[PDB]
Paper text:
Two sequanamycin derivatives, [name]-569 and [name]-977, discovered through serial synthetic modifications of [name]-503, showed improved potency against the Mtb H37Rv strain (MIC: 0.57 and 0.13 μM, respectively). The structures contained tRNAPhe in all three tRNA binding sites and [name] specifically constructed to mimic the state of the ribosome after several rounds of translation. Overall, the structures were similar to that of the T. thermophilus ribosome with erythromycin, and the active sites displayed clear electron density for sequanamycin in the macrolide binding pocket. Moreover, the carbamate group linked to C8 of the lactone ring and an additional sugar mycinose attached to C13 extend the long axis of the molecule down the exit tunnel, away from the peptidyl transferase center. The mycinose group hydrogen bonds with Arg92 of the L22. In addition, G748 forms a hydrogen bond with the 5′′′-methoxy group that sits in a cavity formed by G748 and A752. Compared with classical erythromycin macrolides, we hypothesize that these additional hydrogen bonds are critical for sequanamycins as a second anchoring position to the ribosome. The overall structure of [name]-977 bound to the ribosome is similar to that of [name]-569 except for the carbamate group at C8, on which the NH of the sulfonylamide group forms a hydrogen bond with N1 of A2062.
Here, we report the discovery of a series of macrolides called sequanamycins with outstanding in vitro and in vivo activity against Mycobacterium tuberculosis (Mtb). Sequanamycins are bacterial ribosome inhibitors that interact with the ribosome in a similar manner to classic macrolides like erythromycin and clarithromycin, but with binding characteristics that allow them to overcome the inherent macrolide resistance of Mtb. Members of the sequanamycin family bind in the same pocket of the ribosome as erythromycin. Like other macrolides, the sequanamycins bind in a narrow part of the peptide exit tunnel at a site that lies between the peptidyl transferase center and a constriction in the tunnel that occludes the lumen, near ribosomal proteins L4 and L22.
Numbering used by the authors:
A (entry chain L34A): 1 to 48
B (entry chain L2A): 2 to 273
Amino acid sequence: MKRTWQPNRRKRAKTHGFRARMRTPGGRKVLKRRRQKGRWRLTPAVRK
Amino acid sequence: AVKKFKPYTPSRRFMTVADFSEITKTEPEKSLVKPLKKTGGRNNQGRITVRFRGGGHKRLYRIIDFKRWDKVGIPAKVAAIEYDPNRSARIALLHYVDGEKRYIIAPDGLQVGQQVVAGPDAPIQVGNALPLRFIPVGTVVHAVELEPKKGAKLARAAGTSAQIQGREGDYVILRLPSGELRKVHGECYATVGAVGNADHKNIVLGKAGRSRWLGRRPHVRGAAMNPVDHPHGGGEGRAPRGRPPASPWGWQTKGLKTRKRRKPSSRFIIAR
RNA sequence: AAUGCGCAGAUACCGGGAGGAACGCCGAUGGCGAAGGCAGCCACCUGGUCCACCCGUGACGCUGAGGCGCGAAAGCGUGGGGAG
RNA sequence: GCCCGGAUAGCUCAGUCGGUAGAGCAGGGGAUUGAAAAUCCCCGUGUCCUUGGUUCGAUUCCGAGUCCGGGCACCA
RNA sequence: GUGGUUCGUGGAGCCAUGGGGGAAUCUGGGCGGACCACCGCCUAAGGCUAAGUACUCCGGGUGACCGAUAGCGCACCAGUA
RNA sequence: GCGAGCUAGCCCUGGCCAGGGUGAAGCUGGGGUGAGACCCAGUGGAGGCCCGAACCGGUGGGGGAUGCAAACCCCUCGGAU
RNA sequence: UGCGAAUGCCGGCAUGAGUAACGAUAAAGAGGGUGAGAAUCCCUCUCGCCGUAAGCCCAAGGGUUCCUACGCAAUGGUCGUCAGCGUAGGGUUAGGCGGGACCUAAGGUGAAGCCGAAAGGCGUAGCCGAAGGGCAGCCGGUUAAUAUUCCGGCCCUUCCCGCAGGUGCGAUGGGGGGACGCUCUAGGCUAGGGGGACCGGAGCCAUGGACGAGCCCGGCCAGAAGCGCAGGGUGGGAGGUAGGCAAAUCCGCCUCCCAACAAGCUCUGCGUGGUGGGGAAGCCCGUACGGGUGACAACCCCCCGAAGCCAGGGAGCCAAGAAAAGCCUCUAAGCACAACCUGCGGGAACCCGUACCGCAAACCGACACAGGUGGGCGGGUGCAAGAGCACUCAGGCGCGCGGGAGAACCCUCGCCAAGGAACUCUGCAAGUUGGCCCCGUAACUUCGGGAGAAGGGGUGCUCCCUGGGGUGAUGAGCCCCGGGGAGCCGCAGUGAACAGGCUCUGGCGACUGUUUACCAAAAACACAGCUCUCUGCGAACUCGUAAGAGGAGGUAUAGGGAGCGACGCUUGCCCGGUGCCGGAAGGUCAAGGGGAGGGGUGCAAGCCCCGAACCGAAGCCCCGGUGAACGGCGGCCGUAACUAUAACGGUCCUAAGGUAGCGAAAUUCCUUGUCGGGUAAGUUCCGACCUGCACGAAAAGCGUAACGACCGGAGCGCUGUCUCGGCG
RNA sequence: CACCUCGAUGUCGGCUCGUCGCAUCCUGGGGCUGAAGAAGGUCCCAAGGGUUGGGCUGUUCGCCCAUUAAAGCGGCACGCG
Ligand SMILES: [K+]
Ligand SMILES: [K+]
Ligand SMILES: [K+]
Ligand SMILES: [K+]
Ligand SMILES: [K+]
Ligand SMILES: [K+]
Ligand SMILES: [K+]
Ligand SMILES: [K+]
Ligand SMILES: [K+]
Ligand SMILES: [K+]
Ligand SMILES: [K+]
Ligand SMILES: [K+]
Ligand SMILES: [K+]
Ligand SMILES: [K+]
Ligand SMILES: [K+]
Ligand SMILES: [K+]
Ligand SMILES: [K+]
Ligand SMILES: [K+]
Ligand SMILES: [K+]
Ligand SMILES: [K+]
Ligand SMILES: [K+]
Ligand SMILES: [K+]
Ligand SMILES: [K+]
Ligand SMILES: [K+]
Ligand SMILES: [K+]
Ligand SMILES: [K+]
Ligand SMILES: [K+]
Ligand SMILES: [K+]
Ligand SMILES: [K+]
Ligand SMILES: [K+]
Ligand SMILES: [K+]
Ligand SMILES: [K+]
Ligand SMILES: [K+]
Ligand SMILES: [K+]
Ligand SMILES: [K+]
Ligand SMILES: [K+]
Ligand SMILES: [K+]
Ligand SMILES: [K+]
Ligand SMILES: [K+]
Ligand SMILES: [K+]
Ligand SMILES: [K+]
Ligand SMILES: [K+]
Ligand SMILES: [Mg+2]
Ligand SMILES: [Mg+2]
Ligand SMILES: [Mg+2]
Ligand SMILES: [Mg+2]
Ligand SMILES: [Mg+2]
Ligand SMILES: [Mg+2]
Ligand SMILES: [Mg+2]
Ligand SMILES: [Mg+2]
Ligand SMILES: [Mg+2]
Ligand SMILES: [Mg+2]
Ligand SMILES: [Mg+2]
Ligand SMILES: [Mg+2]
Ligand SMILES: [Mg+2]
Ligand SMILES: [Mg+2]
Ligand SMILES: [Mg+2]
Ligand SMILES: [Mg+2]
Ligand SMILES: [Mg+2]
Ligand SMILES: [Mg+2]
Ligand SMILES: [Mg+2]
Ligand SMILES: [Mg+2]
Ligand SMILES: [Mg+2]
Ligand SMILES: [Mg+2]
Ligand SMILES: [Mg+2]
Ligand SMILES: [Mg+2]
Ligand SMILES: [Mg+2]
Ligand SMILES: [Mg+2]
Ligand SMILES: [Mg+2]
Ligand SMILES: [Mg+2]
Ligand SMILES: [Mg+2]
Ligand SMILES: [Mg+2]
Ligand SMILES: [Mg+2]
Ligand SMILES: [Mg+2]
Ligand SMILES: [Mg+2]
Ligand SMILES: [Mg+2]
Ligand SMILES: [Mg+2]
Ligand SMILES: [Mg+2]
Ligand SMILES: [Mg+2]
Ligand SMILES: [Mg+2]
Ligand SMILES: [Mg+2]
Ligand SMILES: [Mg+2]
Ligand SMILES: [Mg+2]
Ligand SMILES: [Mg+2]
Ligand SMILES: [Mg+2]
Ligand SMILES: [Mg+2]
Ligand SMILES: [Mg+2]
Ligand SMILES: [Mg+2]
Ligand SMILES: [Mg+2]
Ligand SMILES: [Mg+2]
Ligand SMILES: [Mg+2]
Ligand SMILES: [Mg+2]
Ligand SMILES: [Mg+2]
Ligand SMILES: [Mg+2]
Ligand SMILES: [Mg+2]
Ligand SMILES: [Mg+2]
Ligand SMILES: [Mg+2]
Ligand SMILES: [Mg+2]
Ligand SMILES: [Mg+2]
Ligand SMILES: [Mg+2]
Ligand SMILES: [Mg+2]
Ligand SMILES: [Mg+2]
Ligand SMILES: [Mg+2]
Ligand SMILES: [Mg+2]
Ligand SMILES: [Mg+2]
Ligand SMILES: [Mg+2]
Ligand SMILES: [Mg+2]
Ligand SMILES: [Mg+2]
Ligand SMILES: [Mg+2]
Ligand SMILES: [Mg+2]
Ligand SMILES: [Mg+2]
Ligand SMILES: [Mg+2]
Ligand SMILES: [Mg+2]
Ligand SMILES: [Mg+2]
Ligand SMILES: [Mg+2]
Ligand SMILES: [Mg+2]
Ligand SMILES: [Mg+2]
Ligand SMILES: [Mg+2]
Ligand SMILES: [Mg+2]
Ligand SMILES: [Mg+2]
Ligand SMILES: [Mg+2]
Ligand SMILES: [Mg+2]
Ligand SMILES: [Mg+2]
Ligand SMILES: [Mg+2]
Ligand SMILES: [Mg+2]
Ligand SMILES: [Mg+2]
Ligand SMILES: [Mg+2]
Ligand SMILES: [Mg+2]
Ligand SMILES: [Mg+2]
Ligand SMILES: [Mg+2]
Ligand SMILES: [Mg+2]
Ligand SMILES: [Mg+2]
Ligand SMILES: [Mg+2]
Ligand SMILES: [Mg+2]
Ligand SMILES: [Mg+2]
Ligand SMILES: [Mg+2]
Ligand SMILES: [Mg+2]
Ligand SMILES: [Mg+2]
Ligand SMILES: [Mg+2]
Ligand SMILES: [Mg+2]
Ligand SMILES: [Mg+2]
Ligand SMILES: [Mg+2]
Ligand SMILES: [Mg+2]
Ligand SMILES: [Mg+2]
Ligand SMILES: [Mg+2]
Ligand SMILES: [Mg+2]
Ligand SMILES: [Mg+2]
Ligand SMILES: [Mg+2]
Ligand SMILES: [Mg+2]
Ligand SMILES: [Mg+2]
Ligand SMILES: [Mg+2]
Ligand SMILES: [Mg+2]
Ligand SMILES: [Mg+2]
Ligand SMILES: [Mg+2]
Ligand SMILES: [Mg+2]
Ligand SMILES: [Mg+2]
Ligand SMILES: [Mg+2]
Ligand SMILES: [Mg+2]
Ligand SMILES: [Mg+2]
Ligand SMILES: [Mg+2]
Ligand SMILES: [Mg+2]
Ligand SMILES: [Mg+2]
Ligand SMILES: [Mg+2]
Ligand SMILES: [Mg+2]
Ligand SMILES: [Mg+2]
Ligand SMILES: [Mg+2]
Ligand SMILES: [Mg+2]
Ligand SMILES: [Mg+2]
Ligand SMILES: [Mg+2]
Ligand SMILES: [Mg+2]
Ligand SMILES: [Mg+2]
Ligand SMILES: [Mg+2]
Ligand SMILES: [Mg+2]
Ligand SMILES: [Mg+2]
């Protein structure tokens, strides 16, 4: 049937994108945590 | 006049559509239409604040004139009467002599061609707007300002009408479509006559779909829900109210009065 | 008599206001209409009838099964109104 | 089967602080009537359900019993 | 009407302050646990001020600390696959 | 703090619905009458109308049950301006 | 610091076991080649399957999977020489296609401004934002792999700078326009398709016949100007002018004129058209596939014909159908040795995408997963039509384990003597019936229905006759709808495939709809409609601390809340308790006010504590009202001239003691109540009776045509459900 | 009653398949009879085999219809998911 992953490259960057994070104080803390942990990518890998 | 149908389908038995005879123009005055944002009952948070609203035909707002003094003593000819999907009443398109075209809410009787005018002057004739203090007692009148220069806010629904009952200093005694008696300032304007399209109240929607076309989604009784949702929710089968009948927010809904008692306008009201 | 209303200010009296229905006297055992029926007053639209005159038509009449129209009160539908 | 209530004049019923118990109707005797009613005057019988016990004394207080009424018999 | 203090309304002061009221300039004011009297101690409603104190991303020195299932999640291109 | 890329509602803007049936109003003509109501034809082409694919569903049954499948398959069935 | 257990944790290896599986029952066979090795790779032939797809083209997603060369350890449900796999090399070309140096939509953001302990929330303009608006490229060839991108032919657009000719030029401002629904639809075309006796073409004569107007293949595509043929848009002038937030000569409005179902201007579509390309079968080529030839290929006529185009076309209807720019016009500053407009020339024209898969082995589902995924094309014949069904073209595929065998048993399927629901909870299942035409059709009904009711008859082919249309011309040809009469063959003519079993009678719900994604589709929810109630507008109500927003750019014929649920006839009594409503009095009542009077200390002046009357709101009390407000709606004894029963009486209690109508009911315990009906036989069903354990009127009462994948009962038809099994 | 089983001993009837008991429903053998015969009544021996098809209800049971030699009663986790 219709599963839960319906990929949409705009959706991804609009929702979890770097500029998306940077607006909400909650999301800047996501980046803070992700860098402090040393993630290779703070934001989901996307392709325009 | 109101159209009925033969029962060539169920719900056509009782369906009843308005009589569009007094309608003169189909497409509206292009310079006088704005788009209207359809809310679906949601406020500026994305939340519903009025239930069971949405869908229904796309509509185009007709920008209409409820302050008639901004053209004092300039007369106009009644050019058309057209459908307005945004009110119960029908609107009249009038051409002022100086070239401005405006939409007026069309009174009962008025028809294409007649002169119309607003101002303290103004003969007392259906269509003319005047300050109340110069409108003779016992005249039925509609589109009434409640406070001067704040715009007409009283009696604008189909076949509605206020009536002047007497005078008191700066105020005049009005009987509203709700039978309440209120004092309104004499400087408040009012076009004379009643609203018309007065058979609005006899159209019989007929089927569920017709309610949807007006943007009215289905409306579910509290009795049909569960206690989490409504004060009336739950029980086993059916169940009576089991308590003073209430709204989803738990306040009493039979008789319980809600007008703020301390309201300043209390001083100018005298009925029910 | 009691129910009822009344010092939470009633009845009775004065003034202001709202609203509906019916029209005293005239008025009559009177008038009109085919019947049911019709009553304050004003205007408009309109029916029958009577008389005067002896002018016109020339029996074009009378009645009338069916059909069609009207039909007090009460009653029924949709809206309005609601004082007694 | 398990709990609550009641039983008083012929009928339907009040009542009690433990001592002499009443109401209405019915019924009886008189009156009024030509004669019946309706009306007026006058009249209760009650072993206050059975049985035990507390009492000086028990319809009244107590414990059981017959009877009636009511509610219950759930997860299963 | 409340907070802070050991102080939970308690005999409840002191410090702070949202509301109201509302002074004085040394013979003035605040405090010594309701209050009053005496006897004392301080000088509100302006501000600055090192050191001695805390921590460990980092550097070093040590270990009756581990020794690849232990030791940091990672001794190895791990916050990776 | 992260989530309406599944799902529920709503908002904006686009798109889809083979082919058949039925034959409302309105016309127009004829009748009818003092005038009408109304009646009959022909035209017309209305409807949460009918049959039926796409499309949307999920009625009964069989199968499947470490499945092809963490909801599938087959027959059958509902809606389809 | 000692392990045997904690369905302990990590890891390793067993058992089941050479067991179940190897992923759609669309299907295979042979020959040649290659290689160490071949059912599995290449090639030929034969066979089968899809063909409104299982073929082709877009979009999203994926991200080198594309092409080539060399490979086979692993991945591949087997094998593998093959691959979507390993190594390497190559491959994606744009002024016109998509998107950006354009526009705005919901929404986001957001100068000003408002709000919030902080973080932040709101917010007119502005900005951002697209499968909407705007905008200039079609067709062939070429590559192993890109092409509307390279090449070729023909054709456009914008910027800049020049000439030439025009004109008061000139905005982010004014106006026009863009610009809009649903259903039905005229005419004229185009796509697309069929036919041809005509034009062209290799070839063929088989097996009994046929050298024939024989069979087989094909007969086009793009195309500026100018020309036609359709259609769409649009009136032309002059005066007045207070409106379009300045100004307008423009728009609007008024008054004159001429014009008027047109014309004329435009604007699109279509045809023609310079030129430019293509160009089958078959045959020979060695390609996995393309080439050569066929060829100087022909390139015409007729017919069918869109749902597409002319398009802002037309009619009707109600539920009343975006914005902004480009564009035209107008004027403001400013400038008019500028500028703009019109042609013609030369120059200038950037960024990103472009490979491949794309109904699937490359996307979403852990898998090369029988699932899921939007737009366009989707040929032919026949079947009434059609995107339906059967076959089939182009194209693509045989589903990545095979070989045998011929038990039980299982799945999917076919048939069955006699019987025909006896099966069973139940006709569950399967059968039967099935299209079109014509005849015919009851109760009841809200007059529309019920209806496809029911029940029948017809259906193929041959020859003769024959009526209409459309196109041509009124004529032939080609289509389309038919009508009459003779006859032929079979068991059977909708000869295959697709295609209702029917009636009667109850319950419930009026109805089409909606729901427990994934055990419930229903009598549940919704629904038009009815009633109650609130709400005068800065409305009531909802969200939010607030600003603010929805309500609503609405205004009592409106909006919120509650119940009831088309419609018909109706909806009784109780206001004592609870709730709501109304009560300017009374009682009580908190802070506050007020301080009679008491008290602590002081030598006192004082300072400081309590504190009685009395004045004090809402609320409660109290007095009323109120039933489509929460809710409630009795008992016992007696009595009629046969019994029986009780219209009648007596009496206790209550706020009042259940009216109509219905009633063993989706309610009835006793219960399989009793009676009637159906059946041979009926714990069900239908009709009644009333003793209603424990119906009753908007948690509505009693009915009701039509509707129902709802639930019950009966019958006809037909059957492997069954007697009761059998064969395949 | 609460002894095994609550880190699970699936619970009524039907269907299929049976098997055993005998306290025998039929058939077989017998005693007594208030047994003439025929048909019964009641007790004894006997478990080899037999013990029907339908209406109703989920029913077991039961009641009916039509028969029969007869339409037996029980047990096996109220035998057997
Ligand atoms: K509802
Ligand atoms: K309920
Ligand atoms: K009244
Ligand atoms: K009493
Ligand atoms: K007595
Ligand atoms: K303290
Ligand atoms: K202080
Ligand atoms: K101190
Ligand atoms: K001190
Ligand atoms: K410091
Ligand atoms: K290790
Ligand atoms: K680790
Ligand atoms: K139609
Ligand atoms: K272990
Ligand atoms: K093994
Ligand atoms: K391999
Ligand atoms: K596999
Ligand atoms: K766009
Ligand atoms: K402009
Ligand atoms: K042309
Ligand atoms: K490309
Ligand atoms: K097929
Ligand atoms: K075998
Ligand atoms: K049976
Ligand atoms: K012809
Ligand atoms: K059918
Ligand atoms: K009903
Ligand atoms: K359904
Ligand atoms: K539901
Ligand atoms: K609004
Ligand atoms: K009451
Ligand atoms: K009361
Ligand atoms: K009350
Ligand atoms: K005080
Ligand atoms: K009954
Ligand atoms: K009941
Ligand atoms: K019988
Ligand atoms: K019977
Ligand atoms: K149904
Ligand atoms: K257990
Ligand atoms: K035996
Ligand atoms: K089972
Ligand atoms: Mg997942
Ligand atoms: Mg890095
Ligand atoms: Mg506009
Ligand atoms: Mg519920
Ligand atoms: Mg919730
Ligand atoms: Mg609640
Ligand atoms: Mg409730
Ligand atoms: Mg529940
Ligand atoms: Mg209930
Ligand atoms: Mg009100
Ligand atoms: Mg007269
Ligand atoms: Mg004469
Ligand atoms: Mg009458
Ligand atoms: Mg009357
Ligand atoms: Mg009545
Ligand atoms: Mg009336
Ligand atoms: Mg009325
Ligand atoms: Mg007694
Ligand atoms: Mg005694
Ligand atoms: Mg504290
Ligand atoms: Mg305490
Ligand atoms: Mg001290
Ligand atoms: Mg060591
Ligand atoms: Mg480690
Ligand atoms: Mg490690
Ligand atoms: Mg979503
Ligand atoms: Mg969504
Ligand atoms: Mg339909
Ligand atoms: Mg259908
Ligand atoms: Mg059907
Ligand atoms: Mg399609
Ligand atoms: Mg779907
Ligand atoms: Mg199914
Ligand atoms: Mg279907
Ligand atoms: Mg171990
Ligand atoms: Mg290891
Ligand atoms: Mg390892
Ligand atoms: Mg085995
Ligand atoms: Mg085996
Ligand atoms: Mg096997
Ligand atoms: Mg396979
Ligand atoms: Mg081979
Ligand atoms: Mg082979
Ligand atoms: Mg394919
Ligand atoms: Mg992937
Ligand atoms: Mg490849
Ligand atoms: Mg190779
Ligand atoms: Mg392998
Ligand atoms: Mg490949
Ligand atoms: Mg490769
Ligand atoms: Mg630039
Ligand atoms: Mg914001
Ligand atoms: Mg913009
Ligand atoms: Mg576009
Ligand atoms: Mg090409
Ligand atoms: Mg390619
Ligand atoms: Mg090309
Ligand atoms: Mg100009
Ligand atoms: Mg063409
Ligand atoms: Mg053609
Ligand atoms: Mg064709
Ligand atoms: Mg030749
Ligand atoms: Mg031969
Ligand atoms: Mg020849
Ligand atoms: Mg020849
Ligand atoms: Mg062509
Ligand atoms: Mg003009
Ligand atoms: Mg101006
Ligand atoms: Mg024209
Ligand atoms: Mg052309
Ligand atoms: Mg050649
Ligand atoms: Mg149009
Ligand atoms: Mg703009
Ligand atoms: Mg040029
Ligand atoms: Mg491509
Ligand atoms: Mg592929
Ligand atoms: Mg492919
Ligand atoms: Mg492809
Ligand atoms: Mg597709
Ligand atoms: Mg594929
Ligand atoms: Mg494919
Ligand atoms: Mg996949
Ligand atoms: Mg596969
Ligand atoms: Mg697949
Ligand atoms: Mg096709
Ligand atoms: Mg065809
Ligand atoms: Mg067909
Ligand atoms: Mg098909
Ligand atoms: Mg082929
Ligand atoms: Mg397949
Ligand atoms: Mg048979
Ligand atoms: Mg047979
Ligand atoms: Mg038969
Ligand atoms: Mg049976
Ligand atoms: Mg069936
Ligand atoms: Mg069938
Ligand atoms: Mg009948
Ligand atoms: Mg009919
Ligand atoms: Mg009919
Ligand atoms: Mg034949
Ligand atoms: Mg069929
Ligand atoms: Mg029943
Ligand atoms: Mg329904
Ligand atoms: Mg239907
Ligand atoms: Mg479900
Ligand atoms: Mg669903
Ligand atoms: Mg299910
Ligand atoms: Mg279901
Ligand atoms: Mg607002
Ligand atoms: Mg309901
Ligand atoms: Mg004081
Ligand atoms: Mg008070
Ligand atoms: Mg009261
Ligand atoms: Mg009631
Ligand atoms: Mg009820
Ligand atoms: Mg009720
Ligand atoms: Mg109901
Ligand atoms: Mg009923
Ligand atoms: Mg019915
Ligand atoms: Mg339905
Ligand atoms: Mg069988
Ligand atoms: Mg077999
Ligand atoms: Mg135990
Ligand atoms: Mg165990
Ligand atoms: Mg024995
Ligand atoms: Mg035995
Ligand atoms: Mg036996
Ligand atoms: Mg049965
Ligand atoms: Mg039997
Ligand atoms: Mg037992
Ligand atoms: Mg037992
Ligand atoms: Mg058992």
